[model samples]
Target: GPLIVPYNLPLPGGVVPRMLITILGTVKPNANRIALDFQRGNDVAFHFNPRFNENNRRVIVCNTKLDNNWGREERQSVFPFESGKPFKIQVLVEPDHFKVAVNDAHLLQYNHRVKKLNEISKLGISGDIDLTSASYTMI
Candidate 1:
């Protein structure tokens, strides 16, 4: 089934190591930004934000938000997404880091900030893209 934009899916069993979260979507021709967040309560454990033409650069910003305070931003200048193009994003949970791949190509890695993976109970996705589907598998 297709997933709606700005969707929030519950992580019932919580995220564990070796778990892969797959998201399929298309960037809007006029898109500016999009984001994927793994959250626990009101805090965000990992925030995967992709910006297009923002601040004169196409980049991906990874960060963590705790107690409403956003942490240091980890920016990657590698732009793997194209306007009006479909894309696949895979986020693999590692013991100490999150390994991300774009279209099966390695993109970037973000170290765990929030610590406990089981505390992450929601997957929040939003911004300027057409979401096709989202799923998770233990691998």
Candidate 2:
């Protein structure tokens, strides 16, 4: 499993950033899954469980607000899997909009935005699928 990150933007106070994860490659068809771990500030951490299959699409956003001790305000769907097929993960971040898309099909959004972006730091991905290519751009 490869932890792929297309983009990682340093969040400042009152600013939000969006990040996308794309998975493309081959696996045992039904033996692949993706998981994400997010760490914010010095004491907040969030983890997304492994999605079934090698669905190459999943979007995750890290907000600055603290859900007690979590940095995520919302998360999108688990991208579907297709052997050797290309899929996409889309995520949107604002003061409130946290939209996610998997395989350009499944979609999920989160409510409430982080009040601080500087607390967001790392985005990690892991799975059993072979990744073909991945890249991210800051917006």
Candidate 3:
């Protein structure tokens, strides 16, 4: 069974200037969506939401939030998620932005709103999905 939606997992030592996060999971057959978030204190450095069969159903919505105020949402028109299928998401932290990929294909690059990556102490996953593994590496 899936670890319950809105799961919160904190990373040790936070995300420094250069780091990589890799998540392996499967979207539930009845899934409406899934969100992978990196957070810094009261802000979210990046929000990666892969909507499955819901809210237009075929787009990956990306965004950033500072003090809970969301910036303009970014929609990646190329969605490669399927219900009940396995997926691999890789998020790389660069000097200025976060580079993200879905299933080994480059998806989008989201600029850093929270400049201090060290403050980003948590990785959160929510919505409908089965997360098999979530790992990160210091680069």
Candidate 4:
């Protein structure tokens, strides 16, 4: 089972948010699952998944930011990651574009074609490692 790190953020529509996350914990072997949870009344929550393929390590934004709805309009990016390294992730929520910034410099944009934009309330971070600290700011 993965570890669930509690996080709450009040997200809105037509705004971009940046998060600085520091993950510092030992991960279980082959434990590579990242799950995000948000309220179903704000907008949507976008995330990056690097499990599709080697070059397909990109961002996937969920249209319906609900706790149980994890298979919706998922946008993808091109951000790659390695285990045991702390990195910064930036998410830009626009009208039709979900831009992402990683490590304070890397940028990737995804198409915004989600169903609803008013259900993103809180954010939950659960993965295979222990998290150190995370900071989120709306743009």
Task: Identify the leading candidate in terms of lDDT.
Answer: 1
The reply for model 3, stretches above 4 Å from the true place, is 1-5, 53-57
**Model 3's lDDT to the true fold?**
0.82
> lDDT (0-100) at residue 134 of candidate 4?
50
**Candidate 1's error at 72, in angstroms?**
0.7
Q: What's the candidate order when arranged by decreasing TM-score? A: 1, 3, 4, 2
Report lDDT (Cα) of residue 56, candidate 4: 41
Instruction: Report the candidate with higher lDDT, 1 versus 2.
Output: 1
Question: What are the lDDT figures for the candidates, one per model?
Answer: 0.92, 0.47, 0.82, 0.48
**lDDT, residue 101, model 4:** 61
Misplaced by over 4 Å in model 2 are 1-28, 41-46, 53-79, 82-85, 112-114
TM-score, model 4 to reference: 0.54
TM-score of 3: 0.88
> Could you list the CA RMSD of all candidates, in the order they appear?
1.0, 6.5, 1.9, 5.7
Best by TM-score: 1
lDDT of 3 by residue, 55-131 (tens): 55577888888877999998887888888899998888888888988898998898887777778899998877888
Per-candidate TM equals 0.96, 0.53, 0.88, 0.54
lDDT of 4 by residue, 2-75 (tens): 23464444444423334223333343445455444434444334544544233545344444444445555555
In Å, residue 84's CA in model 2 sits off its true spot by 5.9
Instruction: Give stretches of model 4 more than 4 Å off.
Output: 1-6, 12-31, 37-47, 52-79, 115-118
